[PDB]
Structure formats: structure tokens, C-alpha cells
Amino acid sequence: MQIFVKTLTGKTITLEVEPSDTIENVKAKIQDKEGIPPDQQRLIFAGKQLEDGRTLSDYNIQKESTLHLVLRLRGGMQIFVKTLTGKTITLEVEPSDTIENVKAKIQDKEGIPPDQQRLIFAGKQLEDGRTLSDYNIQKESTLHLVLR
């Protein structure tokens, strides 16, 4: 089975699925191809909202069908990043985000290259290959950004 996913913008993509695939798996597939976290995705078919636990068969979705993706304004987990100049930015993150993923999000918002960013939490500079969960960085934790 091969399916289209389309937003309210001109954006459309194609996914490799099976009729047994749950909507949550479809969201994981969208994350893999597109970088959109599942908790920021709402999938729609025939004007109704598809529940994460149901299969594609439960909504009578066939191959060459078009699912509609509406992006949320936020996910479940935010962290705050404070600069030396007293500016705060908030990032939409997941606990599985790596420190390099977080730095890329900061580059997205503020234009600062990742190699010039030092992130600090609880007095420790954070290593690029580790995740937020590795440092026990919780929802609404504040990291400190210092520039090289």
C-alpha cells in the first residue's frame, strides 16, 4: 500500500504503509521522512480525526488515498534556553532529542551555528551525541546558551 499525505500548504509526500499499520505508526513514518514529531501531528481522512491506536483499515483507507496532515502549534514537551543577554527561547523537544538536535533547533530559530553553541545544564556543558533524557532534562527545564 502506497499513500499520499498533504497539508493546507502545497506540501505533499508519499508513504510506504500496510493496511494493518496504526495511525501512530503512520505518524512515526512521517517523523522519519519529514522530521515532524508525532505529538505535533493531527491526521485527517473524510473530515474526521484519526485516533493513534486504530489501523488504516478501520477508516477504510486504500492505496492512492490522500491523508490530510494538520500541524499543531506545539507538542507535549518544551524546554527554555536562556542567553547571556537575558533572552529566552522555547523549543519544542522530545526526551529522545540529542544535544545536536537541540542545537539545530536553536539554529532554526536564532541563526546561530551549532558549533558556536555551548549548552549548559546544572553547571555541566552538554555533549552533542547524548540525549536530553541522558541528562535528566525535564519538561520546562532551563538550559543556558553561551556562545564560543
Partner: protein, 67 residues
């Protein structure tokens, strides 16, 4: 017209999604206010401890002088 019909139903979903998102953000700000209020209580207790201990230092010095 059917293209228009679909866009209105997606837009309706987007309205409901965006209100949910706002309500979560509001809920998070309320909980943050509660956290601020708890810290303000800690500051108050701590300020009280500073005034007491400062006062005890001064009177110890005065009590010792008086002997």
C-alpha cells in the same frame, strides 16, 4: 466546490487543534505561576531567617560587650 468543501473541513479541524494547543499553553502558564508563588514563599521564609540571624549576631555582640 468539492475542493472548497474539503478545505473548510480541514480548516474546522485546525480551529479545534489550535484552541486545544492554546488551552494547554494556558494550563502550562498557570502551573508556572504556581511554581513562581512557591519560590516567593521560599524567599519570604529565607528573608525571615536572615533578619532573625542578623539580629541574633548583633545582640550576641551587644551581650558580650555588656559583660
Amino acid at each position: 466546490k468539492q475542493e472548497l468543501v474539503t478545505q473548510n473541513e480541514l480548516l474546522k479541524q485546525q480551529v479545534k487543534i489550535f484552541e486545544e494547543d492554546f488551552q494547554r499553553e494556558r494550563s502550562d502558564r498557570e502551573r508556572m505561576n504556581e511554581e513562581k508563588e512557591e519560590l516567593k514563599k521560599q524567599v519570604e521564609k529565607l528573608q525571615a531567617q536572615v533578619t532573625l540571624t542578623n539580629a541574633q549576631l548583633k545582640t550576641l555582640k551587644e551581650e558580650e560587650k555588656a559583660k
